[PDB]
Amino acid sequence: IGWRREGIKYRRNELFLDVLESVNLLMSPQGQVLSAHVSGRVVMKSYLSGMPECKFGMNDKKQSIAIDDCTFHQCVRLSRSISFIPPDGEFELMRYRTTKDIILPFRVIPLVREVGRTKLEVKVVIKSNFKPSLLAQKIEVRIPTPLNTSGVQVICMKGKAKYKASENAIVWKIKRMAGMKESQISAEIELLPTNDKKKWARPPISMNFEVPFAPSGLKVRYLKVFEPKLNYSDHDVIKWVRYIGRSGIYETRC
């Protein structure tokens, strides 16, 4: 076995699994999902005695997901689900892609109202869509502003927002938000006169966030360790999982 040496021992046989996903979304201004998909990878860090054979079980085929495709570390034996002797230390067990039944962590709802030739009233609502007892964090909503913008007012009850002139966007940062909640920002965008004819091609509003679960739906069901020679067994292994779901491209046309 060219990725794992022979004399490995730990008194604490311990393992950690990391389900890392990024959810990509393109949504129309009234809420149709135009494109969506998750790219995931599972990373394992193991400190296990000897040459353990491991079995990774997840909810592939009431919580149950669809992998469109996926690829495996050299140690996974192909033929009917997932088996290996892992390398010692940290390594990437698998990489996968999902499109069906994704949990979109946020809905963005834009409202833009032209007020004469002078102002845009913009309202943006964000809805968290996941368990009440879970918190997203590092939320960033980014609202683009046109080239003739002379100044901007904003009010937001949650988080903090700044207009960044050099970037033609209002950036709204929220430290944390629980599931099943709603929040808004209001902005007035003040405009310089501009050449009347050509009209504003509105870029989409983008978000970033991190959520403590897998937008694809993936749940780790078990990580089985059988080591047939050494006097530790599966119950002796201490096991942890963590889910880190982050936005990729997450855009709502407006």
């Binding site: 942890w240 963590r242 880190i244």
Partner: peptide
């Protein structure tokens, strides 16, 4: 903060 990271796995 975060915290996270890890949860116990049965």
């Amino acid at each position: 903060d975060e915290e996270y990271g890890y949860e116990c796995l049965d």
